[PDB]
Amino acid sequence: DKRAKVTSAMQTMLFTMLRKLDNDALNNIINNARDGCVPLNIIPLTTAAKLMVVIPDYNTYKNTCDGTTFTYASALWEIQQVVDADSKIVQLSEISMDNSPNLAWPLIVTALRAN
Amino acid sequence: DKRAKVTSAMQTMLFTMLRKLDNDALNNIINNARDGCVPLNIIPLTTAAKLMVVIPDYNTYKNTCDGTTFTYASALWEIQQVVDADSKIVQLSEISMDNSPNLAWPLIVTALRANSA
Amino acid sequence: NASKMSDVKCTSVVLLSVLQQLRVESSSKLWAQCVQLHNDILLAKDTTEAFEKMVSLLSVLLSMQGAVDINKLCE
Amino acid sequence: NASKMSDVKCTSVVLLSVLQQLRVESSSKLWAQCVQLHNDILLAKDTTEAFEKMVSLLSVLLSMQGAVDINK
């Protein structure tokens, strides 16, 4: 309807403006969201604040996680837990190229903001 | 408190964005408004539609009016009425360089759009 | 000029928000006219139409006497 | 830098309007957080603060599953 056409135009313009801003942190969270790596809470800005993010696949995991460090929104996050689609814990050693087919994706990462 | 500061910041940003757009019709109405030449109602967009504007002084009048034509917002307008600050009707013949000091500025011009946008 | 279209549309959203804060009444015909102009700008396909509608929408703000200080806002 | 500041402020007003149209206002406490972030961006001292607050505000939209389609 008319409301939907206006909304579509406004949302399209929003993303065009964001792209033109060309800020590293905004680009990072938008590109991640395009791949299905999305936050589950408001991304916080202070040390040790909590962040939960969906990690949809092994490629996203490897591009965002190194050891216990998650890199996202131009910041570092200390991974606390990784849980599967069945809410069951996943040990980091299980998240490998060869073993990932056996995990219940998507995973949810819970982390705390570093420095 | 903060509500008035947020409003000031939003309004300042609005005019900065308008300046960056650098459109002649927008620049004309903004620059006229800065000089006190302001619309009294929403500017219409169709042929023969009505508009009222404050003309603050003879310098503005000379910059915007020639005969029965008012030029404003990148459009031409046919003048229907000029009233002075005493709410008296000014016939267009009296708004001359020689008679301008006898008029009660500011004037309010009522006009109809000459052509469609 | 297609490169400016996103900026005119962004500005139209700001302008409508500025008018809302100035208490332009929701039930008013003027508010309905402001909303229609904003919607038409957002839906515009060429800058010529967007700018003509922006002229009308901006005139609402310019017409509110002493509600804003235009010289201050343009310093 | 200054024009980046005006553009990010404009974008924050658009982002709040997009959230408003998605009916976020009915969720009063989330909406209050969104308004506060928008206000922080409009009052931001420098682009670093504006962009950090915009990361938080945009994350509200990105967290709304299926509410929009980012790929388009």
Numbering used by the authors:
A (entry chain B): 78 to 192
B (entry chain D): 78 to 194
C (entry chain C): -1 to 73
D (entry chain A): -1 to 70
The authors write:
SARS-CoV-2 RdRp, also referred to as nonstructural protein 12 (Nsp12), is the catalytic center of the macromolecular complex frequently referred to as the replication transcription complex (RTC). The RTC is essential for virus replication because it makes copies of genomic and subgenomic RNAs and polymerizes antisense RNA. In SARS-CoV-2, besides RdRp (Nsp12), the RTC involves nonstructural proteins Nsp7, Nsp8, and others. Nsp12 is the largest component of the complex, and Nsp7 and Nsp8 are considered cofactors.
We have solved a 1.5 Å x-ray macromolecular crystal structure of the complex between Nsp7 and Nsp8. Below, the description of the Nsp7/8 structure is based on the 1.5 Å structure Nsp7/8C, unless otherwise mentioned. Nsp7 has three consecutive α-helices (α1, α2, and α3) forming a three-helical coiled-coil bundle and the C-terminal loop (residues 62–70) that in some structures is followed by a short, not well-defined helix (residues 68–72). The conformation of Nsp8 has previously been described to resemble a golf club (Fig. 1 A; (9)). The interface between Nsp7 and Nsp8 is made through hydrophobic contacts between six bundled helices. The helices involved are the two N-terminal helices (α1 and α2) from Nsp8 and four helices from Nsp7. The dimer interface area is 2834 Å2 with 72% hydrophobic contacts. Importantly, a symmetrically related interchain disulfide bond is also found between Cys8 of Nsp7 and its symmetry mate.
